[PDB]
Subunit: 114 residues, 2 copies
């Protein structure tokens, strides 16, 4: 439970950009395995992650460190690559979003503090 | 070339930690589909990436920005998750290495 300059950057710069992205819609809420017809989803993916969860954690001071937040972003993207077929559009969508995520992390301010 | 603080950090902290990790050996050279009996590998993975290539690139000043090297690390990890079965050990190895990657990149100096 902490607010830092990096957490504020992850929230207000990085997440804000990804959230509004045209490929973001599948990732803004938990995967709904019922609605989507995916009865094996929770057998394969043991740690579901989504932007809504990450955003709410940033608003509620759940994270102590930027790295913790970056790990949740990574789990979200990795779940997608692991669950889905190589040829699924969703995989391309996740790669596109993940490249922005990495690009933005490369300009995160580096006085990890608060 | 002079080497930005970020690329120096990627070389001396990130690659340093990953290259010597005990889970690193599958990733140190390009995947050999012949040796590994993986006829579909190059059909699924269109951009192979490996730590030997990235390390070479870091030594020979191939990179113009940190994000470029970081993209290569990401491609290497993602290749693995896309090609391999969810239950393969290699996936667990990749995840562990990628966690270190992200942890270190969290503390990377600022650009410029």
């Amino acid at each position: 439970g902490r607010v830092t300059n990096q957490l504020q950057y992850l929230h207000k710069v990085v997440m804000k950009a990804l959230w509004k992205h045209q490929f973001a819609w599948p990732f803004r809420q938990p995967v709904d395995a019922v609605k989507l017809g995916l009865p094996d989803y929770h057998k394969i993916i043991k740690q579901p992650m989504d932007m809504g969860t990450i955003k709410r954690r940033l608003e509620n001071n759940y994270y102590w460190a930027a790295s913790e937040c970056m790990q949740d972003f990574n789990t979200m993207f990795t779940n997608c690559y692991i669950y889905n077929k190589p040829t699924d559009d969703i995989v391309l969508m996740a790669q596109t979003l993940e490249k922005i995520f990495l690009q933005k992390v490369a300009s995160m301010p580096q006085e990890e503090q608060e």
